[PDB]
Amino acid sequence: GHTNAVQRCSFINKQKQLISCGADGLIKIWDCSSGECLKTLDGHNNRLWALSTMNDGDMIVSADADGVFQFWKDCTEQEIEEEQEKAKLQVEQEQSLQNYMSKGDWTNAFLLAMTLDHPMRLFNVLKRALGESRSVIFNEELDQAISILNDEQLILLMKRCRDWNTNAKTHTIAQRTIRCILMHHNIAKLSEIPGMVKIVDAIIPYTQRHFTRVDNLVEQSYILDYALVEMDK
């Protein structure tokens, strides 16, 4: 697999693996049992003549012909430790999200949905939270939560509002959420967030169409007026 000559080879992780240095400047970690390149480390731009390993290769040092030292340190368990903690946290958020939706605690479920980036669950929260609102924009507690959103979450939220707005069956959720943003955020800041304008450029054309409709629904509703005036006669 080396593009050029191999100048050093040493065993690491006891019998399990082997690491080799080549003139191309690429350090390749292979698996002895299967003879396949697990990983490739590229920290040099020249030939590597020397390669030292310490603690079965937990600490690996490679020197470039130019004079550059790359001090590689094993972190496999460290990355595994990090992911396990992330997985543990990721599970707790999901289970808490499911419980909130069942209880109806929308103001909390919305925050969990934004963090996990759950679009379907986020939509249902905004939808059935709106349903209760019919009986300021959404409700006092949830509207406060929308206000606190940072720049990253606003861009994500508006992206969902953009896609929902395209569908005439779901736009009613999109428009109210956008209204809540404009009513509870400094419009100056919203303009400065990078990528907001292009999202807004896509929201406007669909919004006007929905305004052209609904309006036509209103004028058609005047047929009921014509019925009453005829009946009154």
């Binding site: 379907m120 953009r162 929902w164």
Partner: protein
């Protein structure tokens, strides 16, 4: 702006604007969506003895 494929790999986004992240989806839903994608693509000496 035409709503197209989801930018994030985990997310699945349909032309109607509905977006579903794969973590959400139940297994039956995952199977169902995969089948729908299939349709949409298609229209377009010791060892031996013992």
């Amino acid at each position: 702006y035409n709503v197209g494929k989801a930018e994030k790999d985990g997310e699945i986004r349909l032309k109607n604007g509905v977006a579903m992240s794969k973590e959400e989806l139940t297994r039956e839903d995952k199977n169902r969506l995969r089948r729908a994608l299939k349709r949409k693509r298609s229209k377009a000496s010791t060892n031996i003895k013992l």
